Scaffold this active site. Structure first.
Site, PDB file in Angstrom:
ATOM      1  N   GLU A  77       1.820 -75.675  25.020  1.00 34.16           N
ATOM      2  CA  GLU A  77       1.658 -74.493  24.128  1.00 34.16           C
ATOM      3  C   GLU A  77       1.104 -74.967  22.783  1.00 34.16           C
TER       4      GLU A  77
ATOM      5  N   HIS B  99      -6.056 -48.902  36.851  1.00 34.71           N
ATOM      6  CA  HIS B  99      -7.415 -49.460  36.649  1.00 34.71           C
ATOM      7  C   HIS B  99      -7.983 -49.037  35.291  1.00 34.71           C
TER       8      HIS B  99
ATOM      9  N   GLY C 230      10.678 -71.935  16.907  1.00 28.62           N
ATOM     10  CA  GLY C 230      10.615 -71.688  18.356  1.00 28.62           C
ATOM     11  C   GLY C 230       9.771 -70.467  18.686  1.00 28.62           C
ATOM     12  N   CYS C 231      10.308 -69.541  19.469  1.00 29.56           N
ATOM     13  CA  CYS C 231       9.512 -68.433  20.052  1.00 29.56           C
ATOM     14  C   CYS C 231       8.709 -67.707  18.964  1.00 29.56           C
TER      15      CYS C 231
ATOM     16  N   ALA D 261      30.400 -76.774  11.191  1.00 30.21           N
ATOM     17  CA  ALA D 261      31.778 -76.701  11.715  1.00 30.21           C
ATOM     18  C   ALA D 261      31.975 -77.799  12.761  1.00 30.21           C
TER      19      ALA D 261
ATOM     20  N   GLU E 290      -3.075 -54.864  38.254  1.00 28.99           N
ATOM     21  CA  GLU E 290      -3.356 -54.101  39.504  1.00 28.99           C
ATOM     22  C   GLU E 290      -3.728 -55.032  40.658  1.00 28.99           C
TER      23      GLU E 290
ATOM     24  N   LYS F 129       5.851 -69.834  17.202  1.00 31.69           N
ATOM     25  CA  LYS F 129       4.982 -70.206  18.349  1.00 31.69           C
ATOM     26  C   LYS F 129       4.116 -68.990  18.722  1.00 31.69           C
TER      27      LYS F 129
HETATM   28  C1  LIG Z   1       8.878 -74.665  20.138  1.00 30.64           C
HETATM   29  C2  LIG Z   1       9.823 -73.801  20.928  1.00 30.64           C
HETATM   30  C3  LIG Z   1       9.339 -72.657  21.532  1.00 30.64           C
HETATM   31  C4  LIG Z   1      10.181 -71.791  22.256  1.00 30.64           C
HETATM   32  N1  LIG Z   1       9.649 -70.656  22.805  1.00 30.64           N
HETATM   33  C5  LIG Z   1      10.461 -69.852  23.449  1.00 30.64           C
HETATM   34  C6  LIG Z   1       9.971 -68.635  23.996  1.00 30.64           C
HETATM   35  O1  LIG Z   1       8.811 -68.263  23.838  1.00 30.64           O
HETATM   36  N2  LIG Z   1      10.851 -67.841  24.688  1.00 30.64           N
HETATM   37  C7  LIG Z   1      12.154 -68.143  24.816  1.00 30.64           C
HETATM   38  O2  LIG Z   1      12.872 -67.339  25.434  1.00 30.64           O
HETATM   39  N3  LIG Z   1      12.660 -69.303  24.322  1.00 30.64           N
HETATM   40  C8  LIG Z   1      11.858 -70.110  23.664  1.00 30.64           C
HETATM   41  N4  LIG Z   1      12.349 -71.269  23.122  1.00 30.64           N
HETATM   42  C9  LIG Z   1      13.783 -71.573  23.332  1.00 30.64           C
HETATM   43  C10 LIG Z   1      14.688 -70.779  22.421  1.00 30.64           C
HETATM   44  O3  LIG Z   1      14.298 -71.077  21.060  1.00 30.64           O
HETATM   45  C11 LIG Z   1      16.120 -71.252  22.664  1.00 30.64           C
HETATM   46  O4  LIG Z   1      16.387 -71.157  24.045  1.00 30.64           O
HETATM   47  C12 LIG Z   1      17.215 -70.500  21.908  1.00 30.64           C
HETATM   48  O5  LIG Z   1      16.938 -70.472  20.508  1.00 30.64           O
HETATM   49  C13 LIG Z   1      18.541 -71.188  22.109  1.00 30.64           C
HETATM   50  O6  LIG Z   1      19.552 -70.359  21.520  1.00 30.64           O
HETATM   51  P1  LIG Z   1      21.000 -71.005  21.210  1.00 30.64           P
HETATM   52  O7  LIG Z   1      21.914 -69.896  20.850  1.00 30.64           O
HETATM   53  O8  LIG Z   1      21.289 -71.917  22.368  1.00 30.64           O
HETATM   54  O9  LIG Z   1      20.741 -71.914  19.912  1.00 30.64           O
HETATM   55  P2  LIG Z   1      19.740 -72.025  18.662  1.00 30.64           P
HETATM   56  O10 LIG Z   1      18.912 -70.783  18.574  1.00 30.64           O
HETATM   57  O11 LIG Z   1      19.080 -73.364  18.754  1.00 30.64           O
HETATM   58  O12 LIG Z   1      20.790 -71.983  17.435  1.00 30.64           O
HETATM   59  C14 LIG Z   1      21.801 -72.976  17.196  1.00 30.64           C
HETATM   60  C15 LIG Z   1      22.119 -72.994  15.718  1.00 30.64           C
HETATM   61  O13 LIG Z   1      23.342 -73.729  15.452  1.00 30.64           O
HETATM   62  C16 LIG Z   1      23.157 -74.479  14.260  1.00 30.64           C
HETATM   63  N5  LIG Z   1      24.134 -75.550  14.298  1.00 30.64           N
HETATM   64  C17 LIG Z   1      24.127 -76.688  15.113  1.00 30.64           C
HETATM   65  N6  LIG Z   1      25.228 -77.400  14.979  1.00 30.64           N
HETATM   66  C18 LIG Z   1      26.007 -76.688  14.079  1.00 30.64           C
HETATM   67  C19 LIG Z   1      27.301 -76.900  13.561  1.00 30.64           C
HETATM   68  N7  LIG Z   1      28.070 -77.921  13.918  1.00 30.64           N
HETATM   69  N8  LIG Z   1      27.802 -75.966  12.716  1.00 30.64           N
HETATM   70  C20 LIG Z   1      27.030 -74.928  12.384  1.00 30.64           C
HETATM   71  N9  LIG Z   1      25.804 -74.625  12.806  1.00 30.64           N
HETATM   72  C21 LIG Z   1      25.350 -75.541  13.672  1.00 30.64           C
HETATM   73  C22 LIG Z   1      21.704 -74.913  14.293  1.00 30.64           C
HETATM   74  O14 LIG Z   1      21.139 -75.326  13.061  1.00 30.64           O
HETATM   75  C23 LIG Z   1      21.055 -73.629  14.815  1.00 30.64           C
HETATM   76  O15 LIG Z   1      20.765 -72.735  13.745  1.00 30.64           O
HETATM   77  C24 LIG Z   1      11.540 -72.129  22.393  1.00 30.64           C
HETATM   78  C25 LIG Z   1      12.018 -73.313  21.792  1.00 30.64           C
HETATM   79  C26 LIG Z   1      11.206 -74.124  21.050  1.00 30.64           C
HETATM   80  C27 LIG Z   1      11.790 -75.350  20.389  1.00 30.64           C
HETATM   81  C1  LIG Z   2     -15.252 -41.426  30.900  1.00 30.11           C
HETATM   82  C2  LIG Z   2     -14.323 -41.627  32.085  1.00 30.11           C
HETATM   83  C3  LIG Z   2     -13.370 -42.626  32.060  1.00 30.11           C
HETATM   84  C4  LIG Z   2     -12.510 -42.881  33.155  1.00 30.11           C
HETATM   85  N1  LIG Z   2     -11.593 -43.893  33.054  1.00 30.11           N
HETATM   86  C5  LIG Z   2     -10.834 -44.129  34.099  1.00 30.11           C
HETATM   87  C6  LIG Z   2      -9.865 -45.187  34.052  1.00 30.11           C
HETATM   88  O1  LIG Z   2      -9.779 -45.948  33.112  1.00 30.11           O
HETATM   89  N2  LIG Z   2      -9.069 -45.379  35.154  1.00 30.11           N
HETATM   90  C7  LIG Z   2      -9.207 -44.648  36.294  1.00 30.11           C
HETATM   91  O2  LIG Z   2      -8.465 -44.929  37.240  1.00 30.11           O
HETATM   92  N3  LIG Z   2     -10.089 -43.626  36.362  1.00 30.11           N
HETATM   93  C8  LIG Z   2     -10.879 -43.392  35.328  1.00 30.11           C
HETATM   94  N4  LIG Z   2     -11.810 -42.377  35.394  1.00 30.11           N
HETATM   95  C9  LIG Z   2     -11.876 -41.585  36.638  1.00 30.11           C
HETATM   96  C10 LIG Z   2     -12.707 -42.237  37.741  1.00 30.11           C
HETATM   97  O3  LIG Z   2     -14.023 -42.599  37.323  1.00 30.11           O
HETATM   98  C11 LIG Z   2     -12.829 -41.246  38.900  1.00 30.11           C
HETATM   99  O4  LIG Z   2     -11.518 -40.799  39.237  1.00 30.11           O
HETATM  100  C12 LIG Z   2     -13.433 -41.894  40.147  1.00 30.11           C
HETATM  101  O5  LIG Z   2     -14.690 -42.499  39.823  1.00 30.11           O
HETATM  102  C13 LIG Z   2     -13.592 -40.876  41.253  1.00 30.11           C
HETATM  103  O6  LIG Z   2     -14.121 -41.517  42.441  1.00 30.11           O
HETATM  104  P1  LIG Z   2     -14.851 -40.634  43.561  1.00 30.11           P
HETATM  105  O7  LIG Z   2     -15.006 -41.420  44.808  1.00 30.11           O
HETATM  106  O8  LIG Z   2     -14.128 -39.322  43.603  1.00 30.11           O
HETATM  107  O9  LIG Z   2     -16.274 -40.287  42.974  1.00 30.11           O
HETATM  108  P2  LIG Z   2     -17.324 -40.979  41.994  1.00 30.11           P
HETATM  109  O10 LIG Z   2     -16.857 -42.362  41.634  1.00 30.11           O
HETATM  110  O11 LIG Z   2     -17.525 -39.967  40.939  1.00 30.11           O
HETATM  111  O12 LIG Z   2     -18.566 -41.129  42.932  1.00 30.11           O
HETATM  112  C14 LIG Z   2     -19.300 -40.024  43.462  1.00 30.11           C
HETATM  113  C15 LIG Z   2     -20.715 -40.474  43.723  1.00 30.11           C
HETATM  114  O13 LIG Z   2     -21.402 -39.524  44.595  1.00 30.11           O
HETATM  115  C16 LIG Z   2     -22.701 -39.305  44.078  1.00 30.11           C
HETATM  116  N5  LIG Z   2     -23.194 -38.014  44.633  1.00 30.11           N
HETATM  117  C17 LIG Z   2     -22.825 -36.750  44.245  1.00 30.11           C
HETATM  118  N6  LIG Z   2     -23.292 -35.804  45.037  1.00 30.11           N
HETATM  119  C18 LIG Z   2     -24.016 -36.512  45.998  1.00 30.11           C
HETATM  120  C19 LIG Z   2     -24.772 -36.099  47.109  1.00 30.11           C
HETATM  121  N7  LIG Z   2     -24.865 -34.826  47.500  1.00 30.11           N
HETATM  122  N8  LIG Z   2     -25.357 -37.056  47.866  1.00 30.11           N
HETATM  123  C20 LIG Z   2     -25.257 -38.336  47.476  1.00 30.11           C
HETATM  124  N9  LIG Z   2     -24.534 -38.844  46.479  1.00 30.11           N
HETATM  125  C21 LIG Z   2     -23.956 -37.866  45.754  1.00 30.11           C
HETATM  126  C22 LIG Z   2     -22.522 -39.383  42.570  1.00 30.11           C
HETATM  127  O14 LIG Z   2     -23.794 -39.521  41.976  1.00 30.11           O
HETATM  128  C23 LIG Z   2     -21.600 -40.597  42.461  1.00 30.11           C
HETATM  129  O15 LIG Z   2     -22.360 -41.799  42.517  1.00 30.11           O
HETATM  130  C24 LIG Z   2     -12.650 -42.109  34.322  1.00 30.11           C
HETATM  131  C25 LIG Z   2     -13.637 -41.102  34.341  1.00 30.11           C
HETATM  132  C26 LIG Z   2     -14.482 -40.892  33.270  1.00 30.11           C
HETATM  133  C27 LIG Z   2     -15.524 -39.812  33.380  1.00 30.11           C
END
Ligand SMILES: Cc1cc2nc3c(=O)[nH]c(=O)nc-3n(C[C@H](O)[C@H](O)[C@H](O)COP(=O)(O)OP(=O)(O)OC[C@H]3O[C@@H](n4cnc5c(N)ncnc54)[C@H](O)[C@@H]3O)c2cc1C
Ligand SMILES: Cc1cc2nc3c(=O)[nH]c(=O)nc-3n(C[C@H](O)[C@H](O)[C@H](O)COP(=O)(O)OP(=O)(O)OC[C@H]3O[C@@H](n4cnc5c(N)ncnc54)[C@H](O)[C@@H]3O)c2cc1C
Lengths: 497, 500
Positions: free
Chosen positions: B197, B468, B57-58, B125, B473, B61
């Site tokens: 999936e 950003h 399952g999960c 069981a 966002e 997968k």
């Molecule tokens: C392909 C697939 C993908 C999935 N992907 C996700 C996912 O991404 N996210 C998510 O949240 N869920 C996902 N699920 C669902 C998730 O696997 C189930 O919801 C969860 O495992 C159910 O839990 P449960 O306790 O009901 O039973 P199970 O986890 O099915 O366990 C029951 C157990 O009881 C045993 N058993 C049965 N009868 C008896 C018995 N009489 N005596 C003793 N043991 C017994 C079985 O062999 C088994 O081991 C997926 C399911 C599948 C099939």
């Molecule tokens: C390497 C790096 C990575 C970053 N990564 C992120 C990130 O992942 N996430 C995030 O949220 N922020 C990030 N930032 C910050 C983000 O770029 C700045 O906070 C944002 O660009 C500021 O916007 P602003 O309007 O203040 O000025 P700016 O976007 O700096 O624009 C100012 C503009 O005015 C121009 N200018 C300057 N003086 C004059 C003038 N006198 N006349 C005309 N034009 C002029 C400049 O040339 C420029 O074009 C990063 C910054 C850097 C340096």
């Protein structure tokens, strides 16, 4: 009385957003953008830092790095035996092609949005007047309101001989005509760790010079986990050490460090910080007040000159992020022309650092929560664990980095942490996720936290399985407990039973 | 009273619900036994402790889907990212990686039951009375008594007995993850989440893949999101036979000759039934004990209590709840707390998010467009949406296989993302449905599912600051409504967000 309703200086995130929103109300809007070349002559099209030399190219280089890591670590285990060789110039072409299309798209977006785009440097003449050069001649236009949105540019220390002559910055890295080869990154800022992270993942010899601590201002535990992972995958850190001299020695750059050590590199990149680009605006003559850092004082986007506004990276006291620039520009336009009273709530600004393992958070670090509420009123719930897919692949440390046979595994790729206030019914005041897709996971959680989610709301949340994000429904280990928060299980974020 | 019973709790089934309830019960110092035994599949496949999610399952997968995503990245993205690659796929290597990981999970769950003070018995069981269960140990049938019995036996894949050759020649999800021979040209019957999936990952790995779809894809899910998934799967090479089911399945040499309900005939190497699952309850002796079942065979236990008050049920065997691992796990834990720790807590079934791990994934919580319109009326519903490309994917210019091209211009895959919010106008555009098609859909949906459960409105989404650059966002900037009839398609390259 005025030629324009609004003139915007800067065609980046804030400026383009404010200009287009203003023009939707039928207002007459001009926007200036001109890109002064980098310290190494790099220049680029419309759209500002994020589009050209920031978020966009950074995310494309990180994607290339994640592909390299999956080919190296995962592909064979998934049944795909893969040989690969990396061509820097091909990744650069892909980035440049994508950015060139965005430049043209933003140009058309301004015209269609009824914004007059002028490709020229603008300067303030008075509270209602802006000057620029057109075909040799300096021209003046008048406006009821002026928005400053000129953003920042990378900082290079003047006091390090050879820094300005030989170093590149984030303005240059994404477009280099030759691969950078052996690289020194100065600064353990988010820009420096992201850049070092993708260069190391792409196979470059990568060193970070870290003056003190990684990601100053971010949660210590999450910041240190990132550095631990980067070290385990081959990035070298010089801790407490900064260049004092940079010289050309043949084809290499010889760097002399503050501890007396010397090392040669092919590329030296300064990622220490960014200064607001405001020196050309003539702020002092107009009476626009700036802070000691040179940022504009505009806590509600209004400068000391009531006809002049500012948003984005140039404004003191707000995070330097694209979505904060965009939303500030839009809400400013609505307050100016549509009678809005809306401001950003700066308590809920999520962010993601796109390091080799990513880090998303919103709200308070452990340190800021403890500082604001006191240690006794804080619970920290956490789990460190592996993504299911990654656990099954058995990722190994490169041979050269192993301290001994026991040191074979990479660190676990995920850390989930909730910071809660006991006296407010364990209200969540900080959400932290280190791991894959950290921005994708943090976005929706950031809305839940903004709406006042408690630990009980998280515990009662049904998980999506299998995901990393579902871990937030089953956190039980506290920092206070001192118990192991490490999970060595293989079902990933969630519980199969 | 209790003094007559050997155990506090006996659990029948060692899957998601059974192991969770057993361990939670034993944490309160209670005496707990758990039975698990895996009856082999219709093709003889069997496996260890942990149930459907761990073994068939999960878990397997998700590992096959990850291998599929790696194949897609190598084929579509690696060269554009500067990585010139040569690659080939070995089915046997992927199966080994799954088997090694699942064997370690088997061992980890065996250890976790022992350490958690649960007595694990590897035997089938059956119920004897409301307080008694029977099993075989070394030939001899034994009885143990318990204050409470939990049924958590899950389901098994269904194969139609009325299709000649189906049971003899078809595999199911019980077999697909462990096949000793790669499946080659494959027919999947059923456009269930399991079918799409499985077809999705087999196509992505390079197998010739066909889905036989009786009617619609993902019956019960939002129609627009389900159709978008099928559009994407078709554009990447999965073939769909619509309104057609096998009526005959026969061996011709090494291939399986399938005759369809419309008179068409086609040969495949592998035929996989993903039509549905039946609750595995026939061997439990439910009728003799008076445990009431529905007409589908599922146990009637809307609050986990069967018609016999000492007997409980959780997970896939219970009528009217989703067949998901986290719903089985949470139901088992909360049952243990209500039985032994004075809890009053039940799952809120209005907020059960899910993700379909199709080549482009689909996460949602709350109502489909169809269920929201049925419950509130069309006039009281707004649908906001955006269809767009992930930034990194847009930059890669992914192309359709050459055999699916209709012209010079037909090169592109469909946009990989669709974001949709379903809101009720009379409740201040309260969000009642969240839908995301695209990469990492489960990672995106998890957090939003909590925001929606806490009563988020359109305004809360619009005032949310974006991260950003992300796909997630986009939920901060939805503006196009279905009612408007305007294009909700974004052909820009900044991904989920706006850079300006
Ligand atoms: C392909 C697939 C993908 C999935 N992907 C996700 C996912 O991404 N996210 C998510 O949240 N869920 C996902 N699920 C669902 C998730 O696997 C189930 O919801 C969860 O495992 C159910 O839990 P449960 O306790 O009901 O039973 P199970 O986890 O099915 O366990 C029951 C157990 O009881 C045993 N058993 C049965 N009868 C008896 C018995 N009489 N005596 C003793 N043991 C017994 C079985 O062999 C088994 O081991 C997926 C399911 C599948 C099939
Ligand atoms: C390497 C790096 C990575 C970053 N990564 C992120 C990130 O992942 N996430 C995030 O949220 N922020 C990030 N930032 C910050 C983000 O770029 C700045 O906070 C944002 O660009 C500021 O916007 P602003 O309007 O203040 O000025 P700016 O976007 O700096 O624009 C100012 C503009 O005015 C121009 N200018 C300057 N003086 C004059 C003038 N006198 N006349 C005309 N034009 C002029 C400049 O040339 C420029 O074009 C990063 C910054 C850097 C340096």
């Amino acid at each position: 009385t005025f030629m324009y309703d609004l003139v915007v200086i800067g065609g980046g995130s804030g400026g383009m957003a404010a200009a287009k929103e203003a023009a939707k109300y039928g207002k007459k809007v001009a926007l200036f953008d001109f890109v002064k070349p980098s310290t190494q002559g790099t220049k680029w099209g419309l759209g500002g830092t994020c589009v050209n030399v920031g978020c966009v190219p950074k995310k494309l280089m990180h994607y290339s790095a994640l592909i390299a890591s999956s080919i190296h670590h995962d592909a064979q285990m998934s049944g795909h035996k893969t040989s690969s060789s990396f061509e820097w110039g091909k990744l650069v072409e892909t980035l440049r092609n994508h950015i060139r299309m965005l430049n043209f798209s933003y140009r058309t977006g301004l015209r269609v949005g009824n914004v007059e785009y002028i490709n020229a440097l603008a300067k303030l003449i008075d509270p209602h007047s802006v000057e620029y050069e057109d075909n040799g001649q300096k021209k003046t236009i008048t406006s009821r309101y002026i928005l400053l949105a000129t953003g920042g540019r990378p900082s290079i220390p003047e006091t390090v001989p050879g820094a300005i002559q030989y170093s590149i910055t984030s303005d240059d890295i994404f477009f280099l005509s030759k691969s950078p080869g052996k690289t020194l990154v100065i600064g353990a800022s988010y820009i420096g760790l992201e850049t070092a992270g993708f260069l190391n993942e792409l196979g470059f010899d990568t060193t970070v010079a870290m003056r003190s601590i990684p990601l100053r201002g971010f949660d210590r535990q999450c910041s240190e986990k990132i550095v631990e992972y980067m070290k385990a995958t081959g990035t070298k850190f010089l801790v407490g050490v900064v260049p004092i001299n940079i010289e050309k020695v043949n084809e290499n750059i010889k760097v002399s460090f503050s501890d007396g050590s010397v090392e040669e590199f092919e590329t030296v990149l300064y990622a220490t910080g960014r200064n607001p680009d405001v020196k050309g605006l003539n702020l002092n003559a107009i009476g626009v007040e700036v802070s000691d850092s040179g940022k504009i004082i505009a806590p509600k986007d209004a400068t000391s000159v009531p006809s002049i506004f500012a948003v984005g990276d140039i404004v003191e006291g707000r995070p330097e992020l694209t979505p904060v620039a965009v939303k500030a520009g839009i809400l400013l336009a609505r307050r100016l022309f549509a009678g809005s009273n809306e401001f950003i709530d700066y308590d809920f600004v999520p962010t993601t650092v796109f390091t080799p393992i990513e880090y998303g958070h919103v709200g308070l670090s452990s340190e800021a929560a403890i500082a604001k509420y006191g240690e006794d009123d804080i619970e920290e719930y956490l789990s460190e664990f592996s993504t299911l897919e990654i656990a099954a692949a058995h990722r190994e440390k490169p041979e050269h980095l192993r301290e001994n046979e026991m040191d074979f595994a990479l660190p676990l790729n995920c850390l989930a942490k909730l910071v809660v206030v006991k006296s407010q019914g364990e209200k969540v005041v900080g959400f932290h996720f280190v791991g894959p897709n950290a921005g994708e996971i943090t976005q929706g959680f950031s809305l839940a936290v903004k709406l006042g989610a408690t630990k009980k709301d998280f515990d009662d949340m049904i998980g999506i399985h299998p995901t990393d994000a579902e871990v937030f429904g089953i956190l039980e280990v506290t920092k206070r407990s001192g118990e192991s928060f490490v999970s060595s299980g293989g079902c990933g974020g969630g519980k199969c039973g």
